[PDB]
Amino acid sequence: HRIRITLTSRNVKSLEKVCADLIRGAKEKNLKVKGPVRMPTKTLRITTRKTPCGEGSKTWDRFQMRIHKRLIDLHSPSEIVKQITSISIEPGVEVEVTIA
Amino acid sequence: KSYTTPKKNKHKRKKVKLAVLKYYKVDENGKISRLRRECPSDECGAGVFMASHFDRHYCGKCCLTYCF
């Protein structure tokens, strides 16, 4: 009954809406909830050639995506969990449900 | 360009005329006589013969050799 909900989204502000929606979605249903943990992001440093050939000066690319993750624990049964996460889902945020 | 060594030729197939006539010998009765030996494999039991050469046998696909 200590059900874990994980939020993974590429965007910064889009993940902020959904976690705050689940903050509002847990208080409106009045269940014991552990707060959404603002868990550190990771940057994928991809530094390659800008040039296809070997002619030109040495320039290096700087590619970086900062995937960010949250985890929310609910002290509620499984029926309540599937009611909330199945409504108004966006492409940005992925939802993962862990019972333990 | 130019080629010094002549190319090795493709194997021209030796066509056999009336290949089934040289499988059996005819009798005036209603019987058939078998000259070559059938293969004892599971894939081919009776409809496939073996290459009865002058020194040892061979089957086409299952690769079985009957030496003497």
Binding site: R10, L44, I46, T48, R49, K50, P52, F63, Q64, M65 | -
Partner: protein, 55 residues
């Protein structure tokens, strides 16, 4: 022996086993994170994958 000398050479390792997934060329590969992609098309297809140069 055509069917056995065709693929007698192992490709369990080496740089000829892995190539690009568009050009199928065997150079400039970014093997990291299981991309299996040449770097030249990676910059071209950076918008279709997501990669942008913020900083």
């Amino acid at each position: 022996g055509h069917q056995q000398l065709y693929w007698s050479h192992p490709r369990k390792f080496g740089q000829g086993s892995r190539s690009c997934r568009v050009c199928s060329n065997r150079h400039g590969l970014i093997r990291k994170y299981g991309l299996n992609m040449c770097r030249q098309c990676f910059r071209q297809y950076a918008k279709d994958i997501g990669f942008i140069k913020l900083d």
